[PDB]
């Protein structure tokens, strides 16, 4: 059965036009236009967004597309076609000062999402409820991957690394009161600014995790200057703490922030560092060269972790790698092109 006919059967009516938007590794995203102009998004697979959209359908203020239909073999998923300005487009045209209010609004909306859904997290399907347990399991194996990669970079872990890693694993496996619904893959392309507030798209990586896992969006993943990341985390925390008493505790929140940032640094180091060491032309994402990106990630982790009171073997090992790669690479830490104007170098 042709895809167009499959979609028509799914929706109960034939779209006048099916426009491919994004080809992902797992799914094609399609905008389907009805004869009257109305549109929906269909994702075609050739797997928990559907369950996430169902789970969030009563969350207010609305933050996600409503689920519309899923085929019997689950290969086609239809959801609302939410429109707005992507955060990616906003960051390309705004100044730091001009981006602060929408970024604070996003951070606030995410804190309310995490806080409102923390008492509800057991209603997720079992595979999604268990996500933090699976990632903590994988954290154990990540130690050896990190040690081997550091060796290829010429750097040995500082004394006490393994004991400090065991503490990281234990923290990563005990989100406790911070356990909540997380989107899992927040990025400038899947956050919208709309006239009715922020919206989130692309829930493929939804799982039950520490609330702070999603905060890595601006604390560790997208290279926001600290002049924006700090007010975002403060606005996020005020919203989360309105729901969650544990977030009102300065030391508990700081510890959770530090755990997830430390995990993020060492986990994402394994993605492309070997490629960066080899030195071929490469990008972290389009517009952001790979060596400036890792130098940013190294500097941002060391500096912000130190501010959060980190002073152990994991920080010292990151410091040693930073010093090596700064000497070895002629490149400097930098920001992406077309990103909040002319930023002072990090």
């Amino acid at each position: 059965v042709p895809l167009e006919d499959q979609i028509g059967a799914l929706l109960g009516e034939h779209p006048r036009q099916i426009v491919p938007l994004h080809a992902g590794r797992r799914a094609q995203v399609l905008r389907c236009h009805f004869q009257d102009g109305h549109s929906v998004i269909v994702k075609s697979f050739t797997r928990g967004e559907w369950d996430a959209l169902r789970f969030l359908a009563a969350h207010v203020p609305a933050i996600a597309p409503r689920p519309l239909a899923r085929s019997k073999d689950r290969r086609l998923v239809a959801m609302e076609d939410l429109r707005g300005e992507t955060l990616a487009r906003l960051l390309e045209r705004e100044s730091e000062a001009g981006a602060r209010r929408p970024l604070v609004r996003i951070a606030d909306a995410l804190g309310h999402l995490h806080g409102a859904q923390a008492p509800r997290v057991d209603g997720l399907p079992r595979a999604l409820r268990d996500e933090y347990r699976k990632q903590a399991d994988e954290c154990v194996a990540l130690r050896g991957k990190v040690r081997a990669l550091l060796g290829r970079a010429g750097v040995e872990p500082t004394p006490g690394f393994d004991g400090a890693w065991l503490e990281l694993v234990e923290r990563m496996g005990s989100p406790g009161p911070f356990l909540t619904f997380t989107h899992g893959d927040l990025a400038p392309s899947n956050v919208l600014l709309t006239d009715d507030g922020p919206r989130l798209l692309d829930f493929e990586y939804t799982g039950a995790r520490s609330a702070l896992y999603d905060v890595m969006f601006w604390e560790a993943v997208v290279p926001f200057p600290r002049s924006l990341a700090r007010p975002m985390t403060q606005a996020y925390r005020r919203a989360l703490a309105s729901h969650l008493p544990a977030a009102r505790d300065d030391a508990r929140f700081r510890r959770e922030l530090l755990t997830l940032k430390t995990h993020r640094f060492f986990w994402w180091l394994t993605f492309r560092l070997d490629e960066a060491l080899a030195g071929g032309d490469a990008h972290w994402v389009p517009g952001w060269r790979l060596r400036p990106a890792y130098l940013f990630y190294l500097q941002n982790y060391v500096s912000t972790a130190r501010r959060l009171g980190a002073r152990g073997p994991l920080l010292k090992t990151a410091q040693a790698l930073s010093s090596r790669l700064r000497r070895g690479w002629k490149e400097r830490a930098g920001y992406p092109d077309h990103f909040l104007g002319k930023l002072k170098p990090p």
Binding site: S189, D202, V221, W268, F271, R272, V285
Partner: peptide, 9 residues
């Protein structure tokens, strides 16, 4: 992934 990609294998 898809603000970053892991070289999975």
């Amino acid at each position: 992934h898809x603000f970053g990609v892991s070289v999975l294998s």
